[PDB]
Amino acid sequence: HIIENPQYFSDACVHHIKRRDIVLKWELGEGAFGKVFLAECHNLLPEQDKMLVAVKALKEASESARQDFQREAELLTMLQHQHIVRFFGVCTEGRPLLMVFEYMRHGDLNRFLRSHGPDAKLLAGGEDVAPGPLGLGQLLAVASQVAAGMVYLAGLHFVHRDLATRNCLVGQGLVVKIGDFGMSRDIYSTDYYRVGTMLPIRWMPPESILYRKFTTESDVWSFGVVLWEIFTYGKQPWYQLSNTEAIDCITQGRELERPRACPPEVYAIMRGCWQREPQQRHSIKDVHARLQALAQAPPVYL
Numbered sequence: 437h438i439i440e441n442p443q444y445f446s447d448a449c450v451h452h453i454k455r456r457d458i459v460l461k462w463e464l465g466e467g468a469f470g471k472v473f474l475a476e477c478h479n480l481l482p483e484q485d486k487m488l489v490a491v492k493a494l495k496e497a498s499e500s501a502r503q504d505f506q507r508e509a510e511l512l513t514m515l516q517h518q519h520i521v522r523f524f525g526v527c528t529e530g531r532p533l534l535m536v537f538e539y540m541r542h543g544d545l546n547r548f549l550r551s552h553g554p555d556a557k558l559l560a561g562g563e564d565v566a567p568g569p570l571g572l573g574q575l576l577a578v579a580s581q582v583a584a585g586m587v588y589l590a591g592l593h594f595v596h597r598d599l600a601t602r603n604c605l606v607g608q609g610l611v612v613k614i615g616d617f618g619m620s621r622d623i624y625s626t627d628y629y630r631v632g633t634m635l636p637i638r639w640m641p642p643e644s645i646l647y648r649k650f651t652t653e654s655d656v657w658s659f660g661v662v663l664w665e666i667f668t669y670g671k672q673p674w675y676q677l678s679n680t681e682a683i684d685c686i687t688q689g690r691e692l693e694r695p696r697a698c699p700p701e702v703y704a705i706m707r708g709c710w711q712r713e714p715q716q717r718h719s720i721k722d723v724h725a726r727l728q729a730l731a732q733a734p735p736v737y738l
């Protein structure tokens with residue numbers, strides 16, 4: 437293989453994990469192009485010679501696929517922060533290619549929210565969470581932490597483009613962190629519009645649908661929808677409507693209704709996120725600060 441293009445040396449110090457140090461216990465989740473496993477990982481952290489981790493096994497077929505894998509591994513090494521799920525490294529030794537993340541006890545935020553909702557067919561609960569509905573303060577803490585993660589991404593001129601509760605993870609003590617899923621889980625497929633391309637239509641603003649534009653202000657719109665998700669306990673936006681009908685709502689300026697468990701003060705934040713003009717939307721810092729204020733002193737609501 438010979439060099440015939442500009443070569444950029446500069447790179448992220450991506451941590452490589454030996455495959456022998458990863459011990460797969462069992463499958464946690466599955467998608468069309470990947471699996472998530474629970475695993476024990478040796479020699480990863482000090483004085484914690486053994487620890488539980490979430491291991492993504494990704495089916496990267498082409499050379500282009502493995503380039504995307506390396507590109508992503510590079511970005512996640514750079515983007516490490518407090519409300520972003522912790523990425524420990526990769527295993528490109530053999531096949532499949534693995535990405536190692538921290539174990540988040542309660543899984544993704546959508547499934548978590550659904551399991552604590554009023555319409556939950558079974559009660560989910562543990563040592564850290566009470567079965568059934570969460571507190572208003574707990575709901576605000578969740579949103580506030582997600583917002584905090586978005587502040588950091590916006591600071592680095594970085595757009596998620598698929599900000600939704602399904603891509604947020606929930607750990608012990610109800611610590612919420614932003615992650616992502618490229619594996620196309622069969623559980624969250626109706627959340628994406630398919631033609632020929634996969635678009636999270638119901639979470640996307642007018643400018644993305646109409647003009648194909650995505651900025652940090654588009655993530656603010658998407659966060660407003662996450663806020664709606666949280667206060668409906670993981671219900672799908674426009675759940676009655678089809679993908680095209682939902683596109684009609686967003687492009688005609690028809691907004692999501694105030695949830696049953698949502699105070700007007702919290703709905704005002706959502707409405708602020710859903711301004712048609714991106715420049716007219718509140719900054720993610722301003723949204724975060726307002727959520728954090730409300731989390732310290734939750735409003736009274738019936």
Ligand SMILES: Cc1cc(C(=O)NC(C)(C)C)cc(C#Cc2ccc3c4c(oc3c2)C(C)(C)c2cc(NS(C)(=O)=O)ccc2C4=O)n1
Nearest residue numbers: 464465472490515521537539540541542543544614615616
């Ligand atoms: C490419 C990529 C980018 C990023 C990322 O930061 N992007 C930015 C920086 C935000 C843009 C993040 C990621 C990831 C990840 C990740 C990390 C941990 C987990 C876990 C799970 O899924 C996970 C995914 C599932 C949901 C599968 C799980 C289910 C359980 N189910 S249960 C209660 O036991 O029934 C238990 C635990 C977990 C779990 O820990 N990937």
